[PDB]
Design an enzyme around this catalytic site. Structure first.
Site, PDB file in Angstrom:
ATOM      1  N   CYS A 117       0.883  -1.155   0.000  1.00 56.13           N
ATOM      2  CA  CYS A 117       0.000   0.000   0.000  1.00 56.13           C
ATOM      3  C   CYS A 117       0.925   1.209   0.000  1.00 56.13           C
ATOM      4  O   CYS A 117       2.119   1.057  -0.281  1.00 56.13           O
ATOM      5  CB  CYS A 117      -0.950  -0.010   1.203  1.00 56.13           C
ATOM      6  N   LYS A 255      15.786  44.824  24.505  1.00 56.39           N
ATOM      7  CA  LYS A 255      15.840  43.392  24.260  1.00 56.39           C
ATOM      8  C   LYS A 255      17.288  42.982  24.044  1.00 56.39           C
ATOM      9  O   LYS A 255      17.898  43.347  23.035  1.00 56.39           O
ATOM     10  CB  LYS A 255      14.988  42.979  23.060  1.00 56.39           C
TER      11      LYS A 255
END
Ligand SMILES: *O[C@H]1[C@@H](O)[C@H](n2cnc3c(=O)[nH]c(N)nc32)O[C@@H]1COP(=O)(O)OP(=O)(O)OP(=O)(O)O
Length: 517
Positions: A117, A255
């Protein structure tokens, strides 16, 4: 497109009952541009292997319900009979009619019978086990176990196993589906704690019982419905973002470029770090005393912040800045005001530790890293901040804590330092055609196709299937540094946010003049 989960799937398993060779589907040369040479499974490969072993395949049974994978003539020209056996769709297991067709076909045919399959596990194993029971007088237990051991855990759909036992045994004795190996999900979309420094007392948590538990508690503390890292995600500032700074109160902070980490303080030695990938790290000698009872220890506490690398000349010292708090002693502090939570950090976290830091009961040269809180200011003074080391600014609204993407948390970054983390999938190609112009590609999380491409270089093949941080310049993604701490690239939405920023940027002067007046 090639089927998912196919590249990592083994081509073949061991023969079952000396008769059946279970396979995943072959892919013809039509897919060579999508499949690297080492992963190719042309039908010629199967026939050549069988020839090398002086073994003949009498019949190949195709259970895929499609002809788009390979040319049946590649099989039939070798003297192998080819049959396309249509099976029940909609995800249901093969019908009794399908099994009778399979048995009628196979009983006509020492030589092997190939069965495949798309992936070679569920339909293949179902039909093979049905043949073993009905025709070879196997027990269904033996058939299922043997197929599980030949092609690893051969049937993993629970309803398939239940139906096999209902037809051939006792349905109440049907086994549960097996736990799947890691390779099954490597294509669906970090072991290093801190990149560049080695950190004591910090060891990654792979223990299956406690890992899921730490992740689960963080989810429940944040109210996070989906899977993955629950922390708030800031988005890059553009000319349409900055107008939000006028519409409500905001706080700013520099940051530093660091690694996002939530810290869950669940008990005595239960201190854990969680990065963006959901990877967990256990910290040993970090002590968080209760404010009221200095002998007692904190439980059910969740933090948020970055791990930053400070340089005290000659050596780099790790520091963990606490820039938010989600929960405290089960109290939903994250629903309070951002100033309330900043005070919660200062007064209930930093201070109780800093009392025992002057008593000698806590020795900071024993602890894995330095624990501080990130200072926040009003935007008014952010202008002065534009007049430890920072690669940009962050703008925090004063509202309640929100998980996931926060359109209102604004990261401003100087436009030339904008970068994106991609999963590098290098695909050597012909390009020009005489000279083989090889070209690598880039991937983001949650987007199936490539987000963009890149130019292959000799230094670039080094990090392949890895994660790479790229700056944008000169209308090209440019490699700058590999990212060893991410097992995952940036999300498609994060990448699109960065692109929106770079193509509609906010210059330093423009942000300055927005804040000032
Ligand atoms: O040509 C395709 C396609 O047009 C049609 N199809 C598939 N899903 C839908 C749908 O939800 N709605 C409509 N109107 N049409 C649909 O099916 C054709 C191909 O059929 P498949 O054999 O590819 O279906 P498949 O086997 O992939 O389904 P499954 O076995 O994966 O569940």
């Amino acid at each position: 497109k090639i089927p998912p989960r196919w590249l990592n799937c083994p081509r073949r398993g061991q023969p079952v009952a000396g008769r059946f060779l279970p396979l995943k589907t072959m892919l013809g040369p039509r897919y060579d541009s999508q499949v690297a040479e080492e992963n190719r499974f042309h039908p010629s490969m199967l026939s050549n292997y069988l020839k090398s072993l002086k073994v003949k395949m009498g019949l190949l049974v195709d259970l895929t319900n499609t002809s788009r994978f390979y040319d049946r003539n590649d099989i039939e020209k070798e003297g192998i009979k080819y049959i396309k056996l249509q099976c029940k769709g909609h995800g249901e297991c093969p019908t009794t009619e399908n099994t009778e067709t399979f048995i009628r076909l196979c009983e006509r045919f020492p030589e092997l019978i190939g069965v495949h399959c798309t992936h070679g596990f569920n339909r293949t194993g179902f039909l093979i086990c049905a043949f073993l029971v009905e025709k070879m007088d196997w027990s269904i237990e033996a058939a299922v176990a043997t197929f599980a051991q030949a092609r690893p855990p051969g049937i993993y759909k629970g309803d398939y196993l239940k139906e096999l036992f209902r037809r051939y045994g006792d349905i109440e004795e049907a086994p549960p589906p097996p736990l799947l190996p890691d390779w099954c999900f490597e294509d669906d979309e970090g072991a290093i704690f801190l990149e560049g420094v080695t950190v004591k007392g910090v060891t990654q948590v792979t223990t299956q019982p406690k890992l899921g538990e730490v992740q689960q508690k963080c989810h429940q503390f944040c109210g996070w419905e989906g899977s993955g890292f629950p922390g708030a995600q800031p988005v890059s500032m553009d000319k349409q973002n900055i107008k939000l700074l006028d519409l409500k109160p905001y706080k700013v902070s520099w940051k530093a470029d660091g690694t996002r980490y939530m810290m869950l303080i669940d008990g005595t030695n239960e201190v854990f770090m969680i990065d963006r990938d959901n990877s967990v790290f256990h910290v040993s000698n970090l002590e968080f005393p209760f404010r009221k009872d200095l002998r007692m220890h904190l439980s059910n506490t969740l933090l948020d912040g970055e791990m930053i690398i400070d340089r005290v000349n000659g050596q780099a010292v790790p520091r963990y800045l606490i820039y938010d708090i989600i929960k405290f002693n089960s109290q939903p502090v994250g629903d309070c005001d951002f100033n309330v939570r900043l005070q919660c950090i200062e007064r209930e976290i930093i201070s109780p530790r800093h009392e025992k830091m002057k008593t000698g009961l806590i020795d900071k040269t024993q602890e894995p890293f330095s624990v501080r809180n990130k200072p926040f200011f009003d935007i008014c003074t952010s202008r002065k901040l534009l007049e430890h080391e920072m690669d940009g600014l962050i703008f925090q609204p004063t509202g309640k804590y929100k998980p996931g993407r926060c359109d209102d948390i604004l990261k401003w970054k100087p436009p030339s330092l904008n970068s994106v983390d991609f999963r590098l999938k290098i695909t050597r190609m012909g390009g020009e055609g005489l000279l083989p112009q090889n070209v690598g590609l880039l991937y983001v999380g949650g987007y199936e196709r490539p987000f963009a491409q890149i130019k292959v270089t000799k230094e670039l093949k080094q990090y392949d299937n890895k994660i790479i941080e790229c700056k944008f310049e000169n209308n090209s993604w440019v490699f700058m540094r590999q990212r060893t701490d991410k097992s995952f690239p940036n999300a498609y939405n994060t990448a699109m946010a960065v692109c929106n920023s770079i193509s509609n940027p906010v210059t330093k002067e423009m942000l300055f003049e927005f804040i000032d007046r």
